[PDB]
Paper text:
Human [name] consists of serine–threonine kinase and scaffold domains2146. [name] interacts directly with TCF4 and β-catenin, and regulates Wnt signalling. [name] phosphorylates TCF4 and regulates its transcriptional activity. [name] was essential for full activation of Wnt signalling, and colorectal cancer cells were highly dependent on [name] for growth.
Subsequent lead optimization resulted in the identification of [name]-0846 [cis-4-(2-(3H-benzo[d]imidazol-5-ylamino)quinazolin-8-yloxy)cyclohexanol] (left). [name]-0846 showed inhibitory activity against [name] with an half-maximal inhibitory concentration (IC50) value of 21 nM, but its diastereomer (named [name]-0970) having the opposite configuration at the terminal hydroxyl group (right) showed 13-fold lower [name]-inhibitory activity (IC50=272 nM). The crystal structure of the [name] kinase domain ([name]-KD) bound to either [name]-0846 or Compound 9 was determined at 2.9 or 2.4 Å resolution, respectively. The apo (unbound) and [name]-0846-bound [name]-KD structures were almost completely superposable. [name]-0846 binds to the ATP-binding site in a 16-membered ring cyclic conformation by forming an intramolecular hydrogen bond between the benzimidazole N3 and the cyclohexanol O4. [name]-0846 interacts with the hinge region of [name]-KD by forming two hydrogen bonds with the backbone carbonyl and amide groups of Cys108. In addition, the terminal hydroxyl group of the cyclohexanol forms another hydrogen bond with the main-chain carbonyl group of Gln157. This interaction with Gln157 is probably responsible for the potency of [name]-0846, because the diastereomer with the opposite configuration at this hydroxyl group ([name]-0970) showed impaired activity. Overall, the apo and [name]-0846-bound [name]-KDs both adopt an inactive conformation. The RS2 (Phe172) and RS3 (Leu73) residues in the hydrophobic R-spine29 are not correctly assembled, and the salt bridge between Lys54 of β3 and Glu69 of the αC-helix is disrupted in these structures.
Numbering used by the authors: 11 to 174, 186 to 310
């Protein structure tokens, strides 16, 4: 938007890098520390170059505008570490540090690598709330999966890496309308594509991995448009959970419920143990030391 990257402070003495946490949407992400308060913060480092400049301006504008929601990891600020001419400046995107890691981590730190329904129901609702916040502002998340859904040390659920030329990513969370082919040459991301990705995530939570994980990515990409919508393997799960999976995973996107419809789904509303589910989560998080 109206952002000037060269009028940004150097992170020197204001923020510093502690340890690496992982990789994100075009950039590395560190556990950072606020120098004069010792408070933790997530820091995404990106190299500022040709193409990427105006793209950087938009994510910053985006994060400033829409991250003040309780299910969106919050933007703290931005800094440029200016490097010699001819070279790429380093941009530090400073954001709220969700110390419990991703849902993917949660899954692995749970024995058998599956979560309770009550747990899954809580997380999906929170994820949806964040999605509803985004969609209202005409923002598509584009990358919903257990890796981008973070938990805080108070078991709050936050979304990261949203709304941001010839590579193909991992297919397993992609919705049929996103996969370009003969029957569908004009493939673009819809708000309802996020809702499909969420459905996959719910299985990711219920099974430790998404549908078609035991398959070559190119073959999975090929099968997703054609195969019937993925279902829960076991029949152990309640009927409301199975219905919610059916609702999320409607192959034809025109026939797929909108964000607000899924919000009203009984598997989302009927959460009497909400307060309880959160405590179970916070304890399980502490337990990890
Ligand atoms: O998971 C992905 C999520 C997207 C990327 O990093 C983030 C991007 C944006 C903001 C973030 C805030 N807090 C954390 N905190 C945090 C702590 C421990 C983790 N272990 C595994 N991911 C962990 C994320 N990460 C963030 C890369 C990691």
């Amino acid at each position: 938007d109206e952002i000037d990257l060269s009028a940004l402070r150097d992170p020197a003495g204001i923020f510093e890098l502690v340890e690496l946490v992982g990789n994100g949407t075009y950039g590395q992400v560190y556990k950072g520390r606020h120098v004069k308060t010792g408070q933790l913060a997530a820091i995404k480092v990106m190299d500022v170059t040709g193409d990427e400049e105006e793209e950087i301006k938009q994510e910053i504008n985006m994060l400033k505008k829409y991250s003040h929601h309780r299910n969106i990891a919050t933007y703290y600020g931005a800094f440029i570490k200016k490097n010699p001419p001819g070279m790429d400046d380093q941009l530090w995107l400073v954001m709220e540090f969700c110390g419990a890691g991703s849902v993917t981590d949660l899954i692995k730190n749970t024995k058998g690598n599956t979560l309770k329904e009550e747990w899954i129901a809580y997380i999906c609702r929170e994820i949806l709330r964040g999605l509803s916040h985004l969609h209202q502002h005409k923002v598509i998340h584009r990358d919903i999966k257990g890796q981008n859904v973070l938990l805080t040390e108070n078991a709050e659920v936050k979304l990261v890496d949203f709304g941001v030329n010839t590579f193909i990513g991992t297919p397993y969370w992609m919705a049929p309308e996103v996969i370009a082919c003969d029957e569908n040459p004009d493939a673009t991301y819809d708000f309802k594509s996020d809702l499909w990705s969420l459905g996959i995530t719910a299985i990711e939570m219920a099974e430790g991995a998404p549908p078609l994980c035991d398959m070559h990515p190119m073959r999975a990409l090929f099968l997703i448009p054609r195969n019937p919508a993925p279902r829960l393997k076991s029949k152990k799960w309640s009927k409301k959970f199975q219905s919610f999976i059916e609702s999320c995973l409607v192959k034809n996107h025109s026939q797929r419920p909108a964000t607000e419809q899924l919000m009203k789904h009984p598997f989302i509303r009927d959460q009497p143990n909400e307060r309880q589910v959160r405590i179970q989560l916070k304890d399980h998080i502490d337990r990890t030391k």
